[PDB]
């Protein structure tokens, strides 16, 4: 079976979060968890929570074993942006986009 | 009274983009870029219906030249011989014989050689 966890509106850019997602794609969950625990990226703290929530769904709703699970699918989708104004030097107003993303991790034994 | 253009405009744009399938970058995604590519591809396609007939005839003539020179004749001498002896086999069929039916092509070349002298 395949179980997923999703974090919607993760306050980080999809471009930034996809660097971490590319590291754990296709890995066994135990290895992916150790990679995320020692990564210097902010997306790894967020990604690790989604990954271990997917592992918990696989162990409660489906009754699996962490040692049998591997990261089958992980993708980051762009979420809602937040629009902000930053003043510039001569009365110029610049629009700031505060990006968010949707992080979906799917674990599977298969 | 008031006429919205959304449904009709979407149908128009989708017909163009469907024709721009397989094109690179904006040429398959962006309507006002895809529209130019679909028109230009149409200009090329019209012009290349003419060019295809030229390209194939140049290919037949080159193969007939190669086949006839294997038989001791140049292309120009073979065509003149095929007119002296009233042989109306065209170059598309002649180029097919020179590749696939070499004994048949040799017989025709000998018939042209005899007609010349």
């Amino acid at each position: 079976m395949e179980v997923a966890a999703k974090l919607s509106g993760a306050r980080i850019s999809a471009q930034k979060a996809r660097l971490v997602a590319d590291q754990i794609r296709g890995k066994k969950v135990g290895e992916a968890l150790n990679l995320l625990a020692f990564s210097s990226k902010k997306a790894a703290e967020i990604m690790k929570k989604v990954l271990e929530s997917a592992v918990a769904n696989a162990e409660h709703n489906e009754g699996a074993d962490v040692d049998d699970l591997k990261v089958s699918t992980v993708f980051v989708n762009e979420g809602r942006s937040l629009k902000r104004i930053m003043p510039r030097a001569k009365g110029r107003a610049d629009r700031i986009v505060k990006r968010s993303c949707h992080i979906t991790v799917k674990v599977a034994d298969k | 009274a008031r006429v919205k253009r959304g449904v009709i405009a979407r149908r128009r744009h989708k017909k163009i983009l469907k024709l721009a399938k397989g094109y690179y970058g904006a040429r398959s995604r962006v309507f006002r870029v895809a529209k130019q590519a679909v028109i230009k591809a149409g200009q090329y396609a019209y012009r290349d219906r003419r060019q295809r007939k030229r390209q194939f005839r140049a290919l037949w003539i080159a193969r007939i030249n190669a086949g006839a020179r294997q038989n001791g004749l140049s292309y120009s001498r073979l065509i003149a011989g095929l007119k002296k002896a009233a042989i109306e086999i065209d170059r598309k069929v002649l180029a097919d014989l020179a590749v696939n039916e070499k004994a048949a092509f040799t017989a025709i070349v000998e018939k042209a050689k005899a007609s010349l002298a």
Binding site: - | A45, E88, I89, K92, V93, E101
Partner: protein
């Protein structure tokens, strides 16, 4: 065994049992046509070359069906001159089946 026939302003190399698509012939579906303009009949090492027609040679075919080729789009565009006209085309053909080649 193959023959070279003339059909609709063009020439075709044909064998027995071959399916062809030629220019539209005014012959009903299923009727048998007999091509008399045969330019070359080859039985294998027995090449007969017409001058211009192989004397006493006949290729017999059967009209399988009529139809139209895939649509061709014709576009005429003159840039910067406010001119563009489009036109479709489907060429009629007749599908024939070569049922016999005689020397």
């Amino acid at each position: 065994m193959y023959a070279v026939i003339v059909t609709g302003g063009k020439q075709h190399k044909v064998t027995e049992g071959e399916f062809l698509k030629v220019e539209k012939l005014d012959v009903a579906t299923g009727e048998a046509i007999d091509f008399d303009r045969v330019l070359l009949v080859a039985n294998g090492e027995d090449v007969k070359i017409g001058l211009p027609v192989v004397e006493g040679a006949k290729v017999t075919a059967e009209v399988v069906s009529h139809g139209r080729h895939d649509k061709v789009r014709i576009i005429k565009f003159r840039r910067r001159k406010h001119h563009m006209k489009r036109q479709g085309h489907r060429q009629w053909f007749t599908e024939i089946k070569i049922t016999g080649i005689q020397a």
